[PDB]
Symmetry: D2
Subunit: 288 residues, 4 copies
């Protein structure tokens, strides 16, 4: 299987010079660099082409993660918002095709972070989202991209909190390039069973994010990595595994991920590089 | 050890007929019933006396949990709010004295739930809180009440997220009746180690809340119960253990605890009672040495 | 729906006892099953066999049987006279079980136990002879309404079948109705890469399960992953029973055969043994579902 | 922390050309090679000096493991056996001094493997053993060697089966160079708690042997490695950690360790090297 890491582990904002990280992760030994979709729309066609060139030259495959804004909310009861959202994903997805990216993941059926202050209509948001996703799925399938729906803990979203809910949603969407995406941090909170949640996702599991219970890099925390590896083997998983560690305070990243203490224990860039590399060796060894 | 359960496991609002719950948990075998503070400021003297007599007659000890409102935020930069907050706690602690309750717990150094939309000033809030808590602690002590500060996960508060931070805050407060309160649900998210967090709390641990990772009753989930019992034995834990399971959608409870699916799997009241009793048996067997 | 039992040897230091005494004790503690040692059963008159069965019936207890074969009962032996004695022994034993109304026997029935590990080992040869011999005996077991369960043991106690995968390979090769795999948490704990995985491997072939902590204490306060076990039993849709086999006392043949060299019971008298067994029974019913 | 591996992981008899293993292990990155004591009495001083020089040239530290024969049983009720046994360790410890080995471990208070058919007099053997070990320890101190007493599961010995018993025995011996040695494979069977057993050994813990529940290399099994690293940190462990994996059938090793199936799943020497190396990276990452 292929292993990657989210560029945001080193950055405090939802964008960066991605070429810098492609080179970095290739040197550390990663197969994949995951990047935030946010800055992509603002790319000239030329920038898109070189980023793609940088990735090919360094033997790195690029995956994309996205936290939709409120106006990109496919579940919205406001038809103008669903309208804008579909337009947004259609454009983004064509860009991904030109960028040669074949996977996008996140709360793509809703938005993130969300305003939990508003009233919640789970039944109606669910129905609309299923319809909207099915439509965007035609475009994703046209652009050769898997549209991966991240199962999130209750504090970040109310629509899909367990692998079972994820599978139910995707089965309802009933379209080719829509997949369930599990994350060890979120599973850690909502699942009765980690290996059980993965077995439940089975063939709908299109992507996996990793991180310790409190988001440190994989390995020295309490996540049941051996159990996860066995469950991936049981479902014959052949997708990739991207670590999404967040250990630094500050910026929009620190605020959105809610890092209110220095979990990194003052690590500098070199120290962060070394821990990601050690987590990488650890992940290839235990998860495969 | 004494074992209890939060009445909210059966209810969707932050108040209820607590006498009904004292009778229920007594029959199920519990030593303690935790109740929400929310309605207590509106109890008349005889209602307080009746609640206290109900608990005594059923051999049940009452503990109190509270989620402070923004207007009760002891860490507020606004002096008027801190002033209102202290007046609120002073009245509440005196009611707790009348009720023969000796333990209050929750995010008492802050408020809950929190509007995470506002700008966060952790340093100033922390400093203000320590000072406010020091004086409320004095009232609590005079009332014979241990003032327990709950360590919460990052999604619910930003001041105190780990056992180490709670020890840091409580050592700064430096009042014997102010203690750290750990909760398996919250530790499950933030801690590098569960037994480790408990050993770090040590002599400062004044109360423990239990629940599975997704807040089901203790026992069939992934929380490391045996490791918790060993750690409690390592620190000589003298306090009590109260389960806080939340498995039902609806109402303010459902919305504040964010239960967005029927975790109880269609359980009626009798089914809820039976699972709590099995969790009680489990907790006594596994957590005690 | 799942039935739970306990091996009478938990209270005794020799491989036999007044089983009627244990049927009554165990019925009072709440178990569904009492597991008894086969050893004394051939010495029983027809009458005592009928009254043991009436006792079990009168107390609502189901009897299961465990057996450690002697070297002369070794169905895998390269000596044809031993295989012949072995088959005769099991044919007589199985008919007696049919009369006692027991429908399950388990142990290292494909070999013998304890075994003399000083002899040179011929695993391949013993393996082939055993499959053939078990297939034969299976015909009598089927005729007697008895499931012939082959216990998977750790490397220190046997060399033929040490993992759930080897047990399944053996049982599929025997290829006969009433022959099942029997797993034991104490044994799996040593040899398996995965406990849940071993159970899922055994699957439809799992005909019986023995429980005990890593060092053979009653289930619950040890390191065995009980929740994972319960999840795996549900995954396969297990319809059999679960018998705990704790051994915590030094002394006698049981003490040396089970190799208890320290007082694991920590001074427990009979009443304390009963209480711990009952607490483990409540734990097992709750967690294993 | 220094990490090693027992040469027997690649061999089926209790001897081998240790220079070959010193070179192999140094190349794989270990700090220590553990070797069996049994062929050492057959070495000339010239062989000892060249083994010592080879170890030194490759930057490898040597530790020794010994399974005493019934004739080397310091717990024997037979005074002659006790006398011979003491003579055997005196000579051995002198050889280790010559080899610059500072640690020997195993069932040094008894013998291994054990004849279990014999009558067992635990109380008697224990007292004789405490008396004998105390004497040998004066030689061990003179030779600069830590005499480490391995806590074993019940199937391998009856004298010391838990860390508490190990601590009791060493406290009663009351001598400077005697330590308790724990082993994850043995603890996995007898202990109520792994971290608890390590904290119980505390300052008496002089060495740690690692291996999964079924003796595979550390990492992909069920041993609670993070908990072990936590407990080693709690007691401020300054010793070394040597893995003792056994995944091969055949020979005296196969027979004594009771490997009755091919646990290596057809591994060739290079595959065994690779797995040892991944288990080494894992151990350094997770246990420190
Ligand atoms: Mn994620
Ligand atoms: Mn709580
Ligand atoms: Mn058994
Ligand atoms: Mn060892």
């Amino acid at each position: 299987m292929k292993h990657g890491i989210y560029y945001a582990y080193w950055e405090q904002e939802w964008e960066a010079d991605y070429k810098y990280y492609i080179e970095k992760v290739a040197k550390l030994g990663f197969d994949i660099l995951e990047i935030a979709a946010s800055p992509l729309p603002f790319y000239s066609d030329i920038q898109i082409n070189e980023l793609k060139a940088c990735a090919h030259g360094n033997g790195i495959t690029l995956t994309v993660g996205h936290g939709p804004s409120a106006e990109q909310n496919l579940s919205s009861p406001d038809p103008d918002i669903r309208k804008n959202a579909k337009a947004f994903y259609t454009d983004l997805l064509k860009r991904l095709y030109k960028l040669d990216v074949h996977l996008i993941g996140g709360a793509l059926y809703s938005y993130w972070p969300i305003d939990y202050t508003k009233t919640i209509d789970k039944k109606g948001d669910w129905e609309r989202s299923v319809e909207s996703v099915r439509e965007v799925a035609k475009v994703a399938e046209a652009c050769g991209v898997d549209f991966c729906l991240e199962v999130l803990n209750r504090f970040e979203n109310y629509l899909i909190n367990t692998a079972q809910e994820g599978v139910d949603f995707v089965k309802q969407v009933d379209h080719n390039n829509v997949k369930v995406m599990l994350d060890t941090f979120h599973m850690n909170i909502e699942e009765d069973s980690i290996g059980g949640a993965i077995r439940t996702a089975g063939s709908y599991l299109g992507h996996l994010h990793t991180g310790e219970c409190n988001r440190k890099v994989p390995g020295r925390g309490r996540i049941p990595w051996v159990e996860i590896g066995e469950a991936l083997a049981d479902i014959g998983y052949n997708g990739s595994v991207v670590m999404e560690p967040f250990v630094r305070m500050g910026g929009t990243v620190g605020s959105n991920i809610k890092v209110w203490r220095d979990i990194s224990n003052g690590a500098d860039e070199k120290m962060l590089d070394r821990e990601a590399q050690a987590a990488l060796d650890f992940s290839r060894y235990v998860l495969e």
